């Protein structure tokens, strides 16, 4: 089972893809997201992607299909070792503190064009000792339920 907070976060995530609010992600909407992240999938490629997570074969991703796909992806970052690997990706200079510049670098390389302000907000939410950066223990806390 997922936290009710995790399910709530996944709902907001789902809303970013389901731009029309119809309860489904279409090739058009997934295309729009992929293009915002700097990819150019063809209509064929977009249908291939939906197809593998489309349990009822209706050609769109509903929230239950999305949540199944996301819960499965979360297994890539659930072990001590996978969380350490993810920490090393973020902490580019190896000094044990994920800075705003580092978090923006990771997110930009993944295609997400964030504002300084969005980056500062994600740090603020993770930054428990309030030093303006995210350390390993903060990172583990933010990566587990």
């Amino acid at each position: 089972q997922l936290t009710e907070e995790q399910i709530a976060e996944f709902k907001e995530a789902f809303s970013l893809f389901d731009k029309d609010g119809d309860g489904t992600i279409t090739t058009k909407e997934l295309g729009t997201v992929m293009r915002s992240l700097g990819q150019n999938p063809t209509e064929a490629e977009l249908q291939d992607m939906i197809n593998e997570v489309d349990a009822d074969g209706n050609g769109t991703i509903d929230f239950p299909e999305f949540l199944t796909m996301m819960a499965r992806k979360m297994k890539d970052t659930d072990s001590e070792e996978e969380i350490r690997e993810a920490f090393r990706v973020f902490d580019k200079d190896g000094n044990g503190y994920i800075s705003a510049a580092e978090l923006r670098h990771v997110m930009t390389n993944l295609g997400e064009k964030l504002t300084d302000e969005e980056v500062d907000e994600m740090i603020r939410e993770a930054d428990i000792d309030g030093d303006g950066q995210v350390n390993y223990e903060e990172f583990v806390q933010m990566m587990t339920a």
């Binding site: 995530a13 990819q39 992607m49 996301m70 992806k73 890539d76 994600m122």
Partner: peptide, 28 residues
């Protein structure tokens, strides 16, 4: 940024999986 990260890496892996398919075809 936990969920944001797994979504963005999932978007990237949807893309690598589709590239890997066409690559499988080139190789075979």
């Amino acid at each position: 940024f936990a969920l944001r990260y797994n979504i963005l890496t999932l978007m990237r892996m949807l893309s690598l999986k589709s590239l890997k398919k066409q690559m499988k075809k080139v190789k075979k």
